[PDB]
């Protein structure tokens, strides 16, 4: 039964534990049945939390290592954390992408849901692209570029300028241009275009985003101001 699994995952999400939740959702997707709209946000939620934790401890190791600037086992441990929490970070994202192509790629009826699946893929690939430096990391960046372009086409085709998902794709793709792309000109132009699109569906804010869409516009203003600063 599926409903026992989704109640178990939802209950574990209410208990602020994101290991039993991720295991339960991987066990859901391993069945290979197509999700609903509701059962998907739970999967992204735990995955997003895991990505955030990887950025958080790994990010702390990054800045902490710079502060040391010595040559020791404390410094060795900072390097060790880059190899280890980074390897832990790598294992989580590879499990996500394997559960994505294996289950999410196989079943998808809603075209909007496809954008969410492609937006998630670009997110996890970009995070990986941001983390590692080299040729494999460059390949991951290329993978995220193709994924976000594929999502951007369907967003420009069959989405609303005020929907949450198109706004989120514009947001993630703009911060991809700024941080991985390292360009403030094109990134600010893209953010401005996304804000204009969100404003341009005033009637479609009411169902797709409205207050959430306004918050996304505020985030674009924050990003744009920072990049123009």
């Amino acid at each position: 039964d599926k409903e026992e699994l989704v109640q178990r995952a939802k209950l574990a999400e209410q208990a602020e534990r994101y290991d039993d939740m991720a295991a339960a959702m991987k066990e859901v997707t391993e069945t290979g049945v197509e999700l609903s709209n509701e059962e998907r946000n739970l999967l992204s939620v735990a995955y997003k939390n895991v990505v955030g934790a990887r950025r958080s401890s790994w990010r702390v190791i990054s800045s902490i290592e710079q502060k040391t600037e010595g040559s020791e086992r404390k410094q060795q441990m900072a390097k060790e954390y880059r190899v280890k929490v980074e390897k832990e970070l790598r294992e989580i994202c590879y499990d996500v992408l394997g559960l994505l192509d294996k289950h999410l790629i196989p079943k998808a009826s809603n075209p909007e849901s496809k954008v969410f699946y492609l937006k998630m893929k670009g997110d996890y690939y970009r995070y990986l692209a941001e983390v590692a430096t080299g040729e494999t990391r460059n390949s991951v960046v290329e993978d995220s570029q193709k994924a976000y372009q594929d999502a951007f086409e369907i967003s420009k085709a069959k989405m609303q300028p005020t929907h949450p998902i198109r706004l989120g794709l514009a947001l993630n793709f703009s911060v991809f241009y700024y941080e991985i792309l390292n360009s403030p000109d094109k990134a600010c132009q893209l953010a401005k275009q996304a804000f204009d699109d969100a404003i341009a569906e005033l009637d479609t804010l009411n169902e797709d985003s409205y207050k959430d869409s306004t918050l996304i516009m505020q985030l674009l203003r924050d990003n744009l101001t920072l990049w123009t600063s």
């Binding site: 703009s174 911060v175 924050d222």
Partner: protein
Amino acid sequence: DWEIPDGQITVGQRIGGTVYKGKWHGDVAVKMLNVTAPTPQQLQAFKNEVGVLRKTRHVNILLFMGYSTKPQLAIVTQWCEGSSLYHHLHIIETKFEMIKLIDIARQTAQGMDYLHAKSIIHRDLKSNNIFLHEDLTVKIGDFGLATVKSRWSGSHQFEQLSGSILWMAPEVIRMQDKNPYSFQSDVYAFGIVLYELMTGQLPYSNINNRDQIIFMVGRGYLSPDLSKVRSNCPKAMKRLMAECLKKKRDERPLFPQILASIELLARSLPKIHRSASE
């Protein structure tokens, strides 16, 4: 009238004239003249301090509530929950974000602007007399040295110099004029506050000789080392700090100029986070 009939106030704990936590229509702060025979000098002190507070009603001036005479001379003000700026910055080393630090600057300036606008010179502005009420609102307090500018130059007469040295302007220290205080001397003190805000430390930390600091600052030899500002400090703030700290008092910004570098900074320097992921 703001005289609180005797008996109503209920003095409690002590904190640091002398200041107690009391009770009068809720938590209040009670500042008392401990002694029993008030000299006519301590009397005029009281009369003057009350006189100044009476003219203040602004969210960044600590709220005067009333005074008592009969038990002891005392000033009653709002109680504050939360610590002084001194305490945050040098005791519990609160890790404020730069936008917050700028905002504390902003509010402190707002309260000072309001006082100067009614011709009150505070004369004892410093970290300790700036309270972050509920951690969100700057209330400037302690008006024990506050004074109102007299239109006439001969009313001044003789007052023994008192105050904390780290915030005293060189002209005040030197004490060469009949009246060396000015709006500009208050600005200088606020300048030292910017210093604490943008650096995290008091000035002259290598010098522990009290008389030496008085002598070297008054003479022009010594002045705050602006290089100690933390790297996230907006260039506009560093400049604004150096301007408030100018040795030539007229050089330091005043009234509209004071509400220009800080007001201009307020409409600028924002957002330390570029995150947008949702």
